[PDB]
Amino acid sequence: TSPRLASLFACNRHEKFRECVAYADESYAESLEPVAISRLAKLGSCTAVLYPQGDFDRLPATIDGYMAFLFLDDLIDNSTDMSYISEITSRFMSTAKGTPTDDKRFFLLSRFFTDKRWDPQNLVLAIEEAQRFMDGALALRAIEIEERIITVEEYLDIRVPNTAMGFMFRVIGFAQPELAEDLNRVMAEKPDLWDRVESPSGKSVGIALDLFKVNGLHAEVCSYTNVVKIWQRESPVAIDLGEAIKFMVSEFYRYEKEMAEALEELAEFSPGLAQAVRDVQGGTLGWMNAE
Ligand SMILES: CC(C)=CCC/C(C)=C/CC/C(C)=C/CC/C(C)=C(\F)COP(=O)(O)OP(=O)(O)O
Numbered sequence: 001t002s003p004r005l006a007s008l009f010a011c012n013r014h015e016k017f018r019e020c021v022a023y024a025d026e027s028y029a030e031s032l033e034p035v036a037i038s039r040l041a042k043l044g045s046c047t048a049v050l051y052p053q054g055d056f057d058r059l060p061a062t063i064d065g066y067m068a069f070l071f072l073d074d075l076i077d078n079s080t081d082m083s084y085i086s087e088i089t090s091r092f093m094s095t096a097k098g099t100p101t102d103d104k105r106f107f108l109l110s111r112f113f114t115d116k117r118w119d120p121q122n123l124v125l126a127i128e129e130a131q132r133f134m135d136g137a138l139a140l141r142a143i144e145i146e147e148r149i150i151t152v153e154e155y156l157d158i159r160v161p162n163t164a165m166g167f168m169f170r171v172i173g174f175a176q177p178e179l180a181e182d183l184n185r186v187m188a189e190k191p192d193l194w195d196r197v198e199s200p201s202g203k204s205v206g207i208a209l210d211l212f213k214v215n216g217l218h219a220e221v222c223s224y225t226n227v228v229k230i231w232q233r234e235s236p237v238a239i240d241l242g243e244a245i246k247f248m249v250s251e252f253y254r255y256e257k258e259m260a261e262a263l264e265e266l267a268e269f270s271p272g273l274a275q276a277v278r279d280v281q282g283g284t285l286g287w288m289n290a291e
């Protein structure tokens with residue numbers, strides 16, 4: 001249920017995509033399979049389509065980082081109480097800042113954030129965005145617990161950093177190090193232009209993730225933190241889940257158009273960085289449309 005979404009942005013693939021898979025298989029089986037008790041190795045094909053003009057020598061590190069990230073976020077999203085989610089997010093941020101850990105769950109996260117090849121300002125950007133991702137996870141869980149009714153607008157604002165689109169855009173500088181300088185410059189000199197690209201990105205990918213969820217074990221629901229159910233409540237006329245899905249699909253396309261328009265203005269500043277952003281969006285949607 002919920003339809004495939006056709007991104008405006010091509011799903012492009014690194015030429016060593018095969019090596020990316022297998023590195024992921026072999027790395028997972030050695031470093032995550034023991035503790036994880038999985039769709040985790042699949043982040044090989046994914047990194048290869050997120051960073052298709054990236055430097056292959058950075059992709060194995062990025063794969064490990066992203067497998068660890070996905071693993072821990074599954075911890076976070078599955079937690080039912082603020083006390084446990086707070087412990088996990090604080091430990092994530094400690095590790096992201098290079099605090100040593102002997103918790104194997106965090107071993108690959110530490111490898112990635114302490115990679116000596118990071119551009120130093122790029123690394124600071126990535127840590128700060130991971131904090132924003134974590135702050136949104138914490139806020140969304142408070143919402144579902146308190147069963148608080150918010151608007152779609154309020155939700156999407158909270159949700160944007162928690163889609164990790166912005167984090168993946170920051171690691172463009174790691175995976176495609178010829179873009180580190182341009183990444184730093186846009187944040188220092190053109191922050192508002194940057195946010196005009198990042199904000200419709202997070203909104204569209206947020207809507208897409210929420211659309212692709214619904215039901216499995218017995219009742220995920222998430223009635224207060226899934227944009228489809230949020231709109232059901234906010235609509236000024238009664239709408240069922242089906243009609244609600246249709247509307248948010250239309251909103252996906254509207255937010256992607258708004259992102260496209262922004263990327264035209266980013267490309268005059270940096271053609272390379274604009275194209276790398278397209279490919280992160282295009283590969284994310286491409287990879288997601290295995291539904
Ligand atoms: C990157 C995205 C958004 C999707 C697919 C590509 C991928 C596996 C990237 C790994 C990079 C990172 C940091 C991912 C971790 C955070 C994100 C967002 C996810 F886990 C999305 O997976 P989900 O649908 O279970 O959860 P939710 O976001 O709806 O709660």
Ligand SMILES: [Mg+2]
Nearest residue numbers: 073077137162
């Ligand atoms: Mg999440």
Ligand SMILES: [Mg+2]
Nearest residue numbers: 073074077078
């Ligand atoms: Mg999740």
